[model samples]
Target: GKECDCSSPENPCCDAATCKLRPGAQCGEGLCCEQCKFSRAGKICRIPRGDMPDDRCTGQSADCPRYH
Candidate 1:
């Protein structure tokens, strides 16, 4: 389950009471989400890390990186 301030700008799109995503919600997740919504297509949604490269969006609801 998720835990975050649902009213805060940093909190992802999740229901605070249930600590879960509501029906039809994209995600309660990382920087990949833009304003509680999915990022635009071809946009750099995530930054790189030690073991992972940058992540891009596919513009589809609930879809994260363009490639895994």
Candidate 2:
């Protein structure tokens, strides 16, 4: 799989689908959503559904680089 280099501050990828950040891509609330769904409960590239909170961008949201 194509892995992103999250270590670098200048991330390359940016579309809703993929981000340069590793572990996952940065999505809603600036979270690192890992294994992004790209459709349901995942990154912005995906269409979120009901019951999903705006902050629920990704599973790694809490661990995201921007979390702190």
Candidate 3:
């Protein structure tokens, strides 16, 4: 399967736990903020979507996923 590119200039991936955008989601303003939830916490970079609880992944200090 094709993986997400975190370093892509067009579709960059981010820390799903801390970031705000998914692997293939559109990169835009507030797309990679710190609002990930515990259930989706980790180095998985994903786009922000739907309704999430406040301070989902606040205080987390993990590295984001690799993308090239």
**Each candidate's lDDT (Cα)?**
0.57, 0.37, 0.35
TM-score of model number 2:
0.16
Each model's RMSD to truth, in Å?
A: 5.9, 11.6, 12.9
lDDT of prediction 3: 0.35
Off by over 4 Å in 1: 1-12, 22-25, 46-55, 61-68
Candidate 3 local lDDT, 1-68, one digit each (tens): 23332343343344434344564333322323333222234433454568742332222322333333
Clashes of each: 0, 1, 7
| Reference-based TM-score, model 1 | 0.44
| Angstrom error at residue 61, model 3 | 30
Top-TM-score candidate index: 1
Number of the top lDDT candidate: 1
Mark the regions of model 2 whose C-alpha exceeds 4 Å error after superposition. 1-3, 7-30, 33-53, 60-68
